[PDB]
Each structure stands twice: as C-alpha cells, then as structure tokens.
Symmetry: C3
Subunit: 385 residues, 3 copies
Amino acid sequence: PRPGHIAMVSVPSRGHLHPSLELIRELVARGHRVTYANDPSVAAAVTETGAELVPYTSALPTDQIAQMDVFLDDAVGMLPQLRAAYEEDRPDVFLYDVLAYPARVLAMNWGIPSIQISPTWVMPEKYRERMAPVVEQLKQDPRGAAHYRRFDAWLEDSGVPGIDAGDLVNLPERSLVLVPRFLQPDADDVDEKRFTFIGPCLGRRAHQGDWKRPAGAEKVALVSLGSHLTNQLPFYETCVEVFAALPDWHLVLQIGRHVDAGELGELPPNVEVHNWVPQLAVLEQADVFVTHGGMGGIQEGLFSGVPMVVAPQANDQPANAESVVGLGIARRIDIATVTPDRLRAAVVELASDPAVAERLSGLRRELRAHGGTMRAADLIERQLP
Amino acid sequence: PRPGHIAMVSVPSRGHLHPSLELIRELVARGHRVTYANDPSVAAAVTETGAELVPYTSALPTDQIAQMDVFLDDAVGMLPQLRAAYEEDRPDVFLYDVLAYPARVLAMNWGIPSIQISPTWVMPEKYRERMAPVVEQLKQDPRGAAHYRRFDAWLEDSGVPGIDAGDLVNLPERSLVLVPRFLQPDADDVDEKRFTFIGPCLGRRAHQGDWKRPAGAEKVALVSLGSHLTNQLPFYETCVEVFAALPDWHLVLQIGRHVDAGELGELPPNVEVHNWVPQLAVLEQADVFVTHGGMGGIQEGLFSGVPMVVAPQANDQPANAESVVGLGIARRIDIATVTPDRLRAAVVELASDPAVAERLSGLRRELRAHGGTMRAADLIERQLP
Amino acid sequence: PRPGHIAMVSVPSRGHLHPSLELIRELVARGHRVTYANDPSVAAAVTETGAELVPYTSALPTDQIAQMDVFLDDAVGMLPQLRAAYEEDRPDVFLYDVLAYPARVLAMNWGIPSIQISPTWVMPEKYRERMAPVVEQLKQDPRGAAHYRRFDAWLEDSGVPGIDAGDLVNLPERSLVLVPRFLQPDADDVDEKRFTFIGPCLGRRAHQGDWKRPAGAEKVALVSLGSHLTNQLPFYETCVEVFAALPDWHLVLQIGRHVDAGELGELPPNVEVHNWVPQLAVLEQADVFVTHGGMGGIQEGLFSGVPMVVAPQANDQPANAESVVGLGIARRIDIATVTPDRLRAAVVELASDPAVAERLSGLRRELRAHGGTMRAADLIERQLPA
C-alpha cells in the first residue's frame, strides 16, 4: 500500500462534510499524505482529520431551475481553483463528494483515477431514464433550456466533450456510497460493479460528553430536525403539547439556531429545550427519535437502536421516510396536518413494540457488515500504485 | 521577452475585476509568471485566468465623506498585506487597478515599475479643478479636513512624502485605459504620454451557453440593467407591458440577482424572463439593448453592434449615457418618468434607423484599432528586463 | 538572542489584537521569526506588524450558559487548525492571547514553553474560589450538565487530562499582563511569580491623521464611548447641549459607525462630530475625555494625561471605572440617568482641578516603570535557546 497522494474534495455544507471525516482520518493513519480541498469555513473539521487543507472559495450558500443554477455556478467556479491548486502537486487519486464533480473533470484531464464519495443514496440507472421526461419538461421554460446549454458548454470548455452532463456527475467511474443497501431505494437497480455500499464511516467512539435520563423519566424522546435547517414553530408547540400532561416521558426538543425564545416561563421537568444537544449522547439513551429524515440522523438513530418518527420536507427526506417505514422501525407524519393524538400514537407505539426493537438489533448487525471505513480505505488504496 | 514575474493587484468589486481578465490570461499565455493579488471572494475568476492567486483581505463592501473613509481603510489595510506577500518574491512590474494604488506605493519603495489598469474612463486633467473648490470647500467640514489629514499622514508613514494625495491615485506613471477614446469624456485633456486608450480587452468568445433566436422572431430585444445592482421592479412590468402587444419582437428580460420576486402570472409568449442571461450570447442576436449605462454593458453593446436605450442612475452612468448619445447610437430615458408609448418609440426607432446601424459598424471598427489586449500586453512587456 | 521562531496566537476581536501589536513588532525588529496565527479578517493588522500571518478560521462572532458554549466551540475548532499549521514548523515558544489557550494545549503536547498575553487585568486566584458556588449553581440547569463536561472530555482528547478546565485557561505557566498594577483589581491577590504586570506595549508617537487645535478654544474635550461599539443616541444630545453653552470649550464627538442616522441641526461652531476620530490624535490636545471605561480607552487617556469621565455599560467597564475613580483622576456617570448639570460640572471641574493634573502626571510616570514592550520582549526571549 505504498504511501501515495490522495486528494479529497468536498463542499462546506454539513451533510457533505461529516459523513467522510473518519474515512479521511483512516487514510492519514495508514501513512498517506491526504490533501482535502474545501471552503475555509470548515477548516476546523477538515484539519481535525489530519489532512492538508487546500482552500477554495465556495459559491454555495427558490425556483427549481434557480437551485440548479446556483449549483452550476459553484461547479464553474470550483474547477479553476482545483486546477491551480493541484497543477504542480498532482495526486495519485481524486476523491470527491457528489457535489464536487469538478474534481472528476480534473482527473479526466490529467488521466488520474477518481472515486466518488456519496454521503447518501445514489440514483439508480432506471431512475435516470425515468427522470428524462422532466428534462424535456424543463426545456420549454426558457430558463431550463439555457441552464443545460450552459452546462454542456462548460463541459466542452473544460476538455471533456465526450461525456454527458448526466453521465458526468451521476455515473462516476467508481463510487463509495456511505449508506447501507437497506437505506438505498431501488438498490437492485444500482450497478455494484460501479457503486459499493459501504455504510457509514465510523471511528471508535465520539466524545463531547454524556447525557443520562432525568430521574423518573421512563421513556425519552428527541425531536430535532437538526441535520441542519429548522423553522416550524407551530409543530414545535404541538410537541410540548403532546408531552405536557404526559408524565413518565421526557421531551428533549431542539428548536434550532433560528429560535431560542418562544418557550413558556417555567416548563415542567417533562420538557427541556435546547438550541443544540449532543445528538449522539441523547440518542444513546432515548426511546424514540423524531426527525426530518436526513440520512445523518437516520443512520445515527439506526446505530443507536432508536425507532424514529420521520417528518420529511426536502427532496432526500421522503424516500428516507419510506425506507425506515419499510424496515418496520418508523412512522411517517405530514408536517402540514398532524395532530397531538396522531403524534402521541406514533410515539407511544414505537417505544412499546418489542418487534421494532428486535428489528433494530438486526439492522445494527447488517449495518456493520457493509464494511465501513476499513473497507472504503482498502478500496481507495487499491487505486494507488 | 524572457519570462518574468508580473504582479497584478485589484479589488473584489465587480467593475474592477472583469475588465482585465483577458489581459492577465494573455500575459500567462506568453510564458510569464503572473501573480494576481485580490480578495479570496473572487478566487474563482482570478484562478481561471491562469494567474497565481495572492490572497489579501479586502475592507471594501453612507455619506460622501463616509464613503471616502471606507476607501481609505482599504488602502491602509491593503498595503501591509501586499508588502508581506511580495517582500521576498518581488516582481519585475506592478500592475494595479485604480482602487489598488497601494501597489504603486510598493513599487516606489522597491524601485519597481508600476502600471495603472483603469477599467473605465479616467478623470481629465482639468475636470478635477472644477471640483477643486468642492474638495477645498469640503475641508470646511471637520470631516473633509481630517480625512485628507489622515490620507496625508499615511503617505508620510508609507515612505512616499514627495507625492500629493491626488498625484498618487490620479496621476500614475503609466496607465492603461480599457475604454476607447470616444467613451472617454474630455479626451483631449487626457495626456496620452501618460495614459493609453486601449479599449476593452477581449479574447475570442467562450460561448458560455449559446442562445439562438426564436424561429419567426423579427427583432430581438434584451433588457438588463447595466453593470452592478438592480432594484427596479416597476420598470420591469413596463418592459413586459411594452413588449406585450409588440409582436414579432422577442423580449429577453433579466430581473437580476436580488428581488427577483414579483413575477407576472402567465408572461406573454413575447417575453422570456431570467435572473441572469449570457449577455454576450443574447446581444449577438439583439436589435436593441436596454441598460443602465455601465461601461461594461455599453462596451459589450458596442462590440455586438446593438443600439442602446440607456437609463442612467448614478456613478458613471450619466456621463456614459451622454457619450453614447453623442455618438448617435443611443437614446436616454429616465426610468422614473418614461412612459410606455415613449419606450416603444425609442426602441422601434433605434432598431429600424439604418444611420444608427452604420454608425455602429464604424464604432466597431474604431474599437479594434485602439489595440486591445495584444497592445496592452505588448506595452506591459516593454517594462520587463 | 540568536534568532528563533516565536509563534503568536490570538483572536479577531479588536481588544485582543491591538494591545500586542507593538510587542510583536519589537520581536520582529530583534531579528526573530515571528508567526502570528489569527483569522484572515484581521490580516491587515497582523501583517503590518511584520509577522508571518498563519490563517485559521475563527468561530467567534443574553444568556450565561449560552456564551460559554460558543467560546468552547472556537477553542475546539482552533486547536486542530493550529496543530496542522505548526506540526512540521514547530516554534521555540508559543505566545497566546487569553482566548487562544488551545495554543497552550499544543505547547504542552510538544514540550514547548508557552506564555499567555493578557490584554487586560486577569482574575486573581481568589475570585475563582469565590466563583465556585456560581459553578455549582450553574450545573443545575440541564445545560450545566453538558457543557463543562464536554470541556473536560476535550482535555482528554487533546492529550492534557492532568490539567483542570479552569486551571488551563486561567492558570498559565507564565503570563504577561498588559496593564499596570494600579488598573488590576485585587493586585495583591495576584501571584506575580506567574503573572507579570507589563503595562501597555507602545511604539513611538503615531499619526492616525493628527489633529491641530481650533483657534479660540480654551480647553478641548473628546467624547467617544468605550473602546468600540455603542448604540445609545439619546446621551449624545446632552453632550452637545452642555458644550453648546460653553463657548470656551471645543467638543470632538464620536458618534460611531452604528449610528449617523439622526443629528441636531447644522451644529454649532463649538461642536465637531464624526463617526470615527483619531482618538490618540484628539487626546494630544484634550482636556477631558468621556468614555465607557474600556481598558483600551482608559490606558490611552491615562497615557495622554487627560482626566476622564467614565460611563460604564457592559462587563469590565464598571470595575475599570472603579479603578480610575479610586485613583483620583475620573468621575463616574450613568448615561441613562446623568443630567446636563452633573455632566458639565464633572467636565469643567476635572479640567480645572490642579490636583487631578498632578495625579495624572504621576500615574503616567508609574505607567512606563512597568517595563512595557521592551520588558515584555526581554522576558519572551528568555524562553529562547542561547
């Protein structure tokens, strides 16, 4: 495994930084020089891995095409910054997050092997063709048919005309998918010659403290859309509403950076309110976990053996909700409606059902069997001379 | 000649980065080492040139004296960062944007030639004295006579006591003016022993996303407020109002960065609306161009041979509007008061008038004759050993 | 002596940057390699010193426990950035601001001497034991059961379990305190085997634009709150009211970047108003200085021999106000309550009282005797190899 040059590229967004931290640390511990290109705003997390931070300015922070336009601008701006950074310091292999595909373009120009690191499930080969009509239902908007023209023009300018705008990005050379197969929708339609389901990349055990039950709390709940974004005030009060007059339960509600006030000047020991909680520490001793369905929270709930109440909002979240529902460990709620009775029902049932608990035990064993960081590091070292 | 070290210094502001991009790229293509010092927020544009990014922290983002205070802070902060970056890596020549005159101070301290790169027209040798009372009649405010004292003190602190606060900044040793002489007010008062009118610095067209005329469109119009920030929602509706019931014409409206909200239900088939358009690509098929009168849009409208309807607001835009009006290729409107009937009239006259078209052909010919990037690069290379 | 590598670490806040600029410049002027690790937002001040800027991303930008969490995150984020930057370029000594104690953790791992640079007075080792109940009465909030415990866990990760979370931070090996002893509360309870009172670190008589006196002003006054930020417009009206009635005085009022919205008339010829003035330059010709009591402003008024009217607002300013009042060179006012009559008396009396002028002359003499930048640089060079 001759020490070689490994270049990791990602973006500052939280869901694209944490999933691969322990994988990068393992590559450093094996004697390789690892450079990590990301925005300096996440220099703390990058440097803690032990990798060389290679700073670049990220352009990432309403319309559907507008969201695609911002992502294209970041790719256009990202590529020259990596080229200047690595021109005289070329790596043996390029690792890149799903949103850092400009790194693949650089690898193709220099004849260097590249590996995609997917922080969540990938799009199946039948899923691409199924979404092809929406592409033509985007070219009649004069905005969607200028975005793709700009995208194809950028690929031609960047020295890779013989590849599709879909193939580049969503059809990598080789890819490491950091979710287990049972959290990947339509996994049988995913070609495992190309994609490898690794599962999460973990490392011994995290620190930042502990969190034990308040005495006389029989069942513990964590409600946190805390992967990143929260803002739904009416639903939060319903959570305190449900757990009010419900003793033996302890609600640990995380309302998030955007709120801190709004509470009720007192509040029983039944409800404790934070803007941030050590989610792993609370999840280790919790009996139910309410979440938005982000892959990071679900995999953390899975690893801790805690059933989940999923309230999907964005695009990755509904599919995640169906998966854990199909695994018999979760219920799906609709943030638009939901009642305290329906909320309390999903909460009280999930914590009592012993069949749910046995399924978490099995999924916990299936989770590790996917290989984790040790399997991923061996597969990356395979690409080194 | 022989490969040397060329140091370019500019600021992140939009009008001070784009005008010289192709000039720096041309200097790199000639085998020179070109370092480009700018704020990391524009690292994408700097690196794409092929130049070595040399980061420094910019202090650039109320009142007139308040505006003068921030610009002085940036000059005070810029000089030590350039000194530290170039202390042991001194270049053969210093190139600096008009707002990066601290680079000239470094060149004077180190006996290095310096060249000012002006992205628009410079201040004439007599236009200053008409404002000289206002400058001296502002030294009556204890704000104008402490700011200059701060400016004068900084010159003494920086090792250049033998120069006026006006001379350094507004009287460079050598300067490259990136506009044609016919876009420079009072050109006869510009000493061309010192300033050289280069015109815009171009280098082929990078496509950036093509835009073909819609089939069955007689003449195409582009509405985009020229060079920097926009906010005019009511004028946007009048544009859609005018081009509604104006068939055979195709309106390409750019609503711009911010405040995009406030669409209009269906939008007629005549009007297609974007937040950003490839302005060079659209101007290639345009027959009239509505703009704010920024030098960037005007020079881009000139190069494409497209008559312009100019709606100046602040800064350079009123003077720029008179220039293109004096050239017989543009009409000036007041966005607050223009009426829908007058808008279609100014538009329909400009696109139909063949005398306007002939003047544009001549102005296109005059534009190239100023030399462009090839002349600018040749003049810069003369300052190399 | 022999040129070595000195690494300074600080934070972007203004009161943690200016106090040590001239000290770093002196260490550079003495032929040493000085690296200065700070956030790039403050790169201008770092580079002007002449030191090598070592950039790291700072997480520093109501509730007692909430403030403690944000400071811990920045310390947690700072340490790996410092380790990566200095791992193969290790310094002979680590200099660190009070808020950059992760540099001390780095120095302990590498067996390197470290020196704390305190920009203001330190906490005597009796106030902490007095603060032990507040520590005990803060662990009862279920926020009180996650934060410090996270801090203790962080020490174990960083390789320093054999040190307390309080002792590390507030009990350095060696410390340079950049205030004189008469501006340090409970100075006798401060162990000077560990802490050294240096006084401010100065360097020549600067410009900042300079400021000549207007003719026909008998005595000049400068009004500028704390050492940076304010938001209280109403107090400003009383200042011009008091002076626009003393035609013999010349007021130089600093309203601050965070206002400008709202003035009064065209302004009398007695009053000149800015959002920012060269405070050192105005102090050259001033006869009274109104301030909130920030340590930066107080030491500048003290060094200029200018009596002060102190209007404390946030933390440290009342204790600083208490100090300068006890020294017989200042009067204390409450911006919320003070009236024009009490304000005008404090201004004219302080400027007229010759006993105050004599006390200022003596304190300025006491100021220099603490050693300043030359003493501090000599003490740092002692930790360097011969």
